[PDB]
Design a protein around this ligand. Sequence first.
Ligand SMILES: OC[C@H]1O[C@H](O)[C@@H](O)[C@@H](O)[C@@H]1O
Ligand SMILES: OC[C@H]1O[C@H](O)[C@@H](O)[C@@H](O)[C@@H]1O
Ligand SMILES: [Ca+2]
Ligand SMILES: [Ca+2]
Ligand SMILES: [Ca+2]
Ligand SMILES: [Ca+2]
Ligand SMILES: [Cl-]
Lengths: 115, 112
Amino acid sequence: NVGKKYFMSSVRRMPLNRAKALCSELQGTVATPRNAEENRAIQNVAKDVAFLGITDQRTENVFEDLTGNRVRYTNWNEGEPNNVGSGENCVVLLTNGKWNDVPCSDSFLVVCEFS
Amino acid sequence: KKYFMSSVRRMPLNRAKALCSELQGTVATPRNAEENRAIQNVAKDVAFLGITDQRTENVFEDLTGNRVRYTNWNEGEPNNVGSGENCVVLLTNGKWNDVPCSDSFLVVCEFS
Ligand SMILES: OC[C@H]1O[C@H](O)[C@@H](O)[C@@H](O)[C@@H]1O
Ligand SMILES: OC[C@H]1O[C@H](O)[C@@H](O)[C@@H](O)[C@@H]1O
Ligand SMILES: [Ca+2]
Ligand SMILES: [Ca+2]
Ligand SMILES: [Ca+2]
Ligand SMILES: [Ca+2]
Ligand SMILES: [Cl-]
């Protein structure tokens, strides 16, 4: 927890569409760090690489949260985002806390955020 | 402290357990009136609590097998109607009712 936000991690891996459904089921959303403190809190609850609620699906290289709000704070791993291969429009938080853009169809743990 | 969150969909207890455990929580088990009211605050309709008498009839335990102390049964409950009611839901007035574990209700998950 950070301020009014609570972060919980999943135990199993799944693609972002399913991750979204899971957090939405309990009326939360996929975790979106707004500052370094929240980034650390999310990293701490995630025991492995996990999805964040950030994507550039609507407009390439324009990252926004799942409610359409452009993100301000970012913590990209060196070399990212790189939209490699056929494209990478979702975002995961690596085990060192930095971010990587990855295919939304790939599976990772999910960290959900509740307020 | 404990944090309570309600589901949007209705499901039987086994699925409710699976949902809460997916985010490393458990089905809400109020230990006093304050927590019972906190669960009421988040549940918009009848919802499962993490309590059952599946082991021994009329002996209620939380999902980890710990016998509960605080209870808030609705008048006339628990009545174990018909083929049996071994699960528990929080009614919209905050009182509890024992119901079939196979019936579907909203679920309130608990995290600490
Ligand atoms: O070299 C880093 C590169 O490795 C893989 O290709 C994927 O994880 C990419 O998302 C990442 O950018
Ligand atoms: O009359 C109360 C009775 O109504 C139905 O039969 C069920 O909801 C029971 O669990 C409950 O005890
Ligand atoms: Ca992209
Ligand atoms: Ca990448
Ligand atoms: Ca019973
Ligand atoms: Ca009953
Ligand atoms: Cl993608």
